[PDB]
Amino acid sequence: MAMEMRLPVARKPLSGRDTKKHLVVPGDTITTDTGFMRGHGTYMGEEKLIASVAGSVERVNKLICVKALKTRYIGEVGDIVVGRITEVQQKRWKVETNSRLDSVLLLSSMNLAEDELAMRGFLQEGDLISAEVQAVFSDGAVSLHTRSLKYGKLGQGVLVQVSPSLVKRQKTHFHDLPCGASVILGNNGFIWIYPTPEHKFIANLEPVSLADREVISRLRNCIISLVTQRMMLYDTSILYCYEASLPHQIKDILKPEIMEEIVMETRQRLLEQEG
């Protein structure tokens, strides 16, 4: 039983950026070429396109928008999402994600009066669900639907909340790693980690074995370290973080120096196999 205190280390700038992305702060003027449509994250002022959120700019052939760095989750059609149930209303559930409103899940989408009082039993207040996004309401509320049986109420696992602008828009988010743990990389800021089943819903409440648990908890701390050092989060990055985590024991990697060397080695590996 040992405890450690330290003086708080002052942050260092740590510099070569090599970036030509064009950057705006709110209030300044976007360069107007005639034949732009409109954008989100900007507005019309005095017949001049004025950006409204600090960040970078993106230009499409017709669309000019401003991409920020930390927003809450925006409703998108084809995305998979993880959410937490808050209230049990009469015809629908209220699901909280990191969106600007609590998302709504109608009962007509859930694959299982006879429904009204039994609605409470098979989907408990406060569990964790994963679903595809059905559509978007008019005011910006997001509606989600469980189409296939790979969605549903989740297992026991562990959850980590991140910023939703730090994950790739890359297909097949469901990754079952060769380490022994499966992960759901939601398109919002949720990452779910659960042990892999061999049978291939019902709550399998048996205790998970120790090596499986320690692999699960090694992935979680690497995800925390990645989102702390502000890098993109995807499957090969998680694998190289696991490989870089293998020399050190699990408790010590939340010290910042071990985090620095893991992120540096992972970024070097990703860059050298990038091309």
Partner: protein, 239 residues
């Protein structure tokens, strides 16, 4: 003695500001977090962003967002210990003016049925509290990415011996008497908020107002650098 031979008590002339340093992204637990300091006045601002209404659901407006601002000073701010419960009158006003300035330019139009909360806590007050709180809240909002009209900057000004003074300390607000704080958005020159508690004569008024606005523009020429510097060292880590 406040200004003799062009020099003030702090040792600075009539136009230049204090040294102000703003740091973004302190509390990763919250959504937007900023810490600013103007001389010895410390200000801390936290915004939890557009979250849905938790309780008392009749408060929601159908078209635009709702802005909730709460001002709380620390109990150990000045020499005399003051208590924030049962001392609410000064604070209630300081919250409602923040509500005014951030319903002014926050674009509530893009967020129907949405609650945006702005919490400002002051850690050490050395005069010019209101401007420091507005600047901290502006940096905190631009952390969390709520899209707004313009960068918002606030400052203060006084009038002593025929000369205008900018960015008063606690000493200069104590003995002097003419205070005038304003909040300004500089893209259009529109004064967002005025505060003045004085015995100031009409013929001087325009002069000090110009100096006040000039000080505000200097704040806009400093914090902008910080914001751009911050966002630049975001993008190098991303792409």
């Amino acid at each position: 003695l406040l200004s003799d031979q062009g020099y003030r008590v702090d040792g600075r002339r009539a136009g230049e500001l204090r040294k102000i340093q703003a740091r973004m992204g302190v509390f990763a637990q919250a959504d937007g977090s900023a810490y600013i300091e103007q001389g010895n006045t410390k200000a801390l601002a936290v915004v939890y962003g557009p979250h849905e209404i938790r309780g008392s659901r009749a408060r929601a407006l159908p078209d635009r967002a709702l802005v909730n601002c709460q001002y709380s000073s620390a109990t150990f701010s000045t020499g005399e210990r003051k208590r924030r419960p049962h001392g609410d009158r000064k604070s209630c006003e300081m919250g409602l003016q923040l509500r005014q300035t951030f319903e002014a330019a926050i674009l509530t139009q893009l967020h129907p049925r949405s609650q945006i909360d702005i919490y400002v806590q002051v850690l050490q007050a050395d005069g010019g509290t209101y401007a420091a709180c507005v600047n901290a809240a502006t940096l905190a909002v631009l952390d969390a990415g709520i899209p707004m009209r313009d960068f918002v900057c606030a400052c203060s000004a006084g009038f002593v011996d025929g000369t205008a003074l900018a960015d008063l300390s606690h000493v200069e607000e104590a003995a002097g008497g003419p205070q005038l704080a304003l909040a300004l958005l500089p893209a259009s020159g529109q004064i967002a908020l005025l505060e003045m508690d004085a015995r100031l004569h009409e013929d001087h008024l325009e002069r000090v107002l110009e100096a006040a606005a000039q000080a505000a523009r200097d704040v806009h020429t400093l914090l902008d650098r910080v914001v751009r510097q911050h966002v630049r060292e975001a993008s190098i880590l991303l792409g």
